[PDB]
Every structure is written in C-alpha cells, then in structure tokens.
C-alpha cells in the first residue's frame, strides 16, 4: 500500500527505512525471545514522542513538556542494559522527516508478533494491585455525590419544572421547602449557603 | 467510574476557575486546557505568557492528581502526554487539529476473516471493502482507496 | 456457557422483582462467581483477562449499565459511549481547537492521562454515595453501590 501512489507521499527510501526498523526489531526478537515484547511495546510511545516534536515545529516558542521525553529516555536506557537494539530502534524513528511514515510505524506495533503469555504472573499482579489497601477521604466522595445530585435536579427541573425530592419528609426550617412546594429554583447566592 | 472521574475534573476545574474540554471513554482521558491572549509587543512577553499558561495547566493537573489520590486512583505524571499542537484519543492521532487515519492497520486486515467466519466469496471481500471505506472516511480525495 | 442457551433454558427474569431483591438483600453466594480468560493480540507477558460473570451478575451489570447509559451519561459531555462517528468527530474538533494556527492568541494544551490500573484501584468507599444517588434517582437506593 506504499508503492507508486497517485499521491506521491512514500518513496523507496521510506520503505527502506521501514524495513530497517523491521530488521532492528527482528534482531531484538532474535537475541531475546518472548522477553523482547517488553521493549517493542515502546514503539507506539516513541512514535507519539516523534509526532509532538514534529507538531511543535510550526509553533516552537512553547515551552517543552519534558516528562514524557525523560520517561522514554529512562526506559530506553534501562532496556539497553538488556538489549542494545532498542537504542537503535529509538534513534531511527526520530530520523524520520515526515508524518506519514511515523503513522505507518505507529500502526505497525503488531508487526513483530505476540508472546506466550505467562498467566501466573498476570494473575499474581492482578491479585496484588486489586487487594492494595487504600487511604480515602470520604468527604470528597460525598461532595461528588452532592454535585451529581445538583446536576440531575437542575436538569430535570429545567425540563419538567418540578423537584424530585419530597417536601413532606423535608424539615420546616429547610431553605429548599418553599422552592419545592411552589415550583422554583434557588438563587446562585442562595445555593452557596447549602454547599455539599 | 468515568462519571466519577468527570465529577472530580469538573469540581477541580471550577475550583481553579479554569476552562477545560474533556474526552473520556474510561481509563483513557484527554483534558484540554484552553487559553487566549492579545497581540504581544515583543517575544519576551509572549514567552512569559506561555510560561504562565503551562504553569496554570500543571496547577490544574496537580489538583486533579490530588483528587484522584483522595479517591484512591493514581496518575503517573511521568507518563502524562502534554502538547499544544497534537492530540490522541482512541488510537486516532490529531496532528495540528487535522484528524488522520492509520491506513496500514486497515490494509493489514485484508483476507483476515473474523471469529467463526470461513474464507468465502462474500467474507473475504468484506475484509477489503470495510477497510477501504474506513480509509476513505478518514482521508481526503478518496482516489487511492479505490485503486 | 452461552448466553442464548441459558436464556432459553432458564426462567424469564422479572426485572422489577429482580431489582427489588437486589436492592433489599443483594444476591446469594451461589451466583457470585467470576471466571477469567486471557486476552488476544496483546504485547504483554503478564496478561490481561476477560470477565465471565454469572447469569445473575451478568444481567445485573448489563441492565444497570444500560440505565446509566440511557439517563446519566447524556448529562456529561465527554462520555463518547452513546455517540456515533460524526459526534466523535465534532467533539474531537471542538477539543482540538487552538491547534495548528500559526498564532499564539489562542492555544489549547492537551493532557493525556495514564492511570495505573484504573479498573483495579476502584473501592467502595470512593464510589458509594455517587452510586447511591443513582439508585435513588432510579427508584432503587442501594442498588448500584453493591458492586
């Protein structure tokens, strides 16, 4: 799908670049086997890292966002202690000058195969990350629930002109007893005194 | 859970008093912070304005991180992707605002039938028909798709 | 087991009394059983799995997600679940504004967030009341927080 197109995007040199990327990944798969896909998995991120810097050329005065760049750099430096091949795989994807080739590579993460899954480690990690003990601020959840209730009541009142609460159960000193009996909505200053 | 995350985002955005667009299907979420300014007198003022833009952006993102932490959800700040001329949502790049379709992923599925489907006169041709239509939908001048 | 065979073999589930019992006393320990099966075409050695719920749990989750999708999701802009292709394009165009304009007077900044096990780090104490509100608005308080 990338030879002799009416839209002369791809040349033969671009296909040579793609096949060189394939060969690098295949050498990685030849040295390391099923443990190579921990490294090939970093193909789609790097592509994204190559798109931003391409998108940044037209508007380059914006400050950098070095978190993702430093993460990719660190992960590549760590993987290079296992197989140096990825250090090349990261350097040839940055050498691409066009976006179409970067997309052709982004849609090619699956073009190196799949591993034999070790379901033991997966189940272990699932049980681990599931049963982790958490520290939670319940008041925040209460606040979010109040926000959801406010949203629902406001929408249903705008639509039906009616409150979906009960004024009989509600106390007599409540600020939302008059607005409920006679169909009304409070003032924005009256709602801030009833927060959460 | 997505509704919960959106409630968090709305609350923290209103607290920051910041305008935000949101796209979400679950674990993958894009929170686009929007800004506008005036004509600058020089490049120094423009660069300072951009510094303040990114400062406010990281402020709201820190607030959202703290919210998700109070809820018991983590946000890896070393993996968050930030860019002012590129977006990504559902494995669909958006380069300088223009939507782009991954053509090769579609042609790679030619002759690849689906689950419980025998190679057949009617089934093997759908593999190319659907993918060509999909390539044409996300592409201008659908002439290459026909060829 | 398959869903259709079980439906044709088991009784017809009265949704009213079903939700009534789910709300008053939940389910028994015989229907609380979840299987697992690995995922296909994944580049991970650890392994992500499927979720084979039981008949009662499957029906509960399905109908409750249907209710959420029909009623609460439209209130929130960003949940691209009920949407279709044209609506997704509209939303991605709105969010992608301020990109590729050769000017700094209008700038968007996207934030693609990576959640560390978004689906596993959920806890009852973080989405109890937010689901109790949903159950209230559906006529079944203490229905959805029982997950």
């Amino acid at each position: 799908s990338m030879v002799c197109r009416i839209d002369n995007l791809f040349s033969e040199q671009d296909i040579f670049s793609l096949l060189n990327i394939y060969r690098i990944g295949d050498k990685i798969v030849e040295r390391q086997g099923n443990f190579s896909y921990d490294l090939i998995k970093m193909v789609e991120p790097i592509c994204n890292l190559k798109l931003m810097k391409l998108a940044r050329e037209s508007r380059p005065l914006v400050p950098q966002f070095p978190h993702f760049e430093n993460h990719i750099k660190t992960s590549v430096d760590e993987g290079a202690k296992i197989d140096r091949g990825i250090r090349f795989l990261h350097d040839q994807i940055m050498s691409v000058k066009t976006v179409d080739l970067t997309l052709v590579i982004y849609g090619s993460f699956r073009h190196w195969g799949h591993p034999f899954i070790d379901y033991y480690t997966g189940l272990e990690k699932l049980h681990s990350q599931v049963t982790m003990k958490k520290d939670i601020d319940v008041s925040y959840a209460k606040a979010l629930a109040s926000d959801l209730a406010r949203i629902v009541l406001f929408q249903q009142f705008n639509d039906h002109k009616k409150w979906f609460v009960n004024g009989d159960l509600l106390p007599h000193d409540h600020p939302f007893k008059s607005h409920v009996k006679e169909n009304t909505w409070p003032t924005a200053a009256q709602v801030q005194d009833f927060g959460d | 859970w997505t509704i919960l995350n959106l409630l968090v985002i709305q609350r923290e955005a209103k607290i920051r008093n910041t305008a935000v667009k949101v796209l979400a299907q679950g674990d993958n979420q894009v929170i686009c912070t929007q800004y506008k300014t005036k004509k600058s007198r020089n490049v120094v003022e423009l660069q300072g304005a951009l510094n303040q833009m990114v400062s406010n952006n990281e402020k709201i993102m820190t607030a959202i991180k703290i919210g998700t932490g109070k809820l018991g959800l983590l946000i890896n700040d070393d993996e968050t992707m930030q860019s002012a001329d590129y977006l990504n949502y559902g494995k669909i790049p958006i380069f300088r605002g223009v939507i782009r379709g991954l053509e090769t992923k579609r042609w790679s599925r030619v002759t690849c039938v689906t689950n419980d489907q025998i190679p057949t006169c009617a089934n093997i041709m759908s593999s190319v028909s659907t993918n060509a239509l999909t390539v044409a939908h996300f592409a201008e001048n659908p002439i290459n798709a026909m060829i | 087991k398959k869903v259709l065979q079980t439906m044709l073999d088991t009784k017809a589930t009265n949704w009213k009394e079903f939700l009534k019992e789910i709300d008053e006393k939940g389910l028994d320990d015989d229907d609380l059983i979840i299987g697992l099966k690995g995922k296909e075409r994944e580049l991970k050695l650890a392994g992500r799995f499927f979720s084979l719920m039981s008949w009662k749990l499957r029906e509960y989750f399905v109908i409750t997600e249907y209710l959420i999708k029909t009623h609460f999701v439209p209130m929130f802009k960003g949940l691209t679940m009920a949407d279709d292709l044209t609506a997704v394009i509209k939303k991605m165009l709105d969010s992608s504004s301020g990109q590729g304009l050769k000017s700094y007077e209008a700038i968007c900044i996207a934030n693609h967030i990576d959640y560390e096990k978004w689906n596993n780090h959920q806890r009852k104490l973080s989405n109890g009341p937010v689901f109790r509100v949903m159950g209230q608005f559906l006529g079944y308080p203490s229905l959805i927080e029982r997950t």
Binding site: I117 | - | G38, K39
Partner: peptide, 16 residues
Amino acid sequence: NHADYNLNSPLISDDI
C-alpha cells in the same frame, strides 16, 4: 469449517 483461520485466541505455551 469448524476451525479457526486467523489469530483470534490467546497464545499459550502449555500444549507444546
């Protein structure tokens, strides 16, 4: 006919 023709299942090293 009652068989698969493309990869639509996980890959496991327990039968080989």
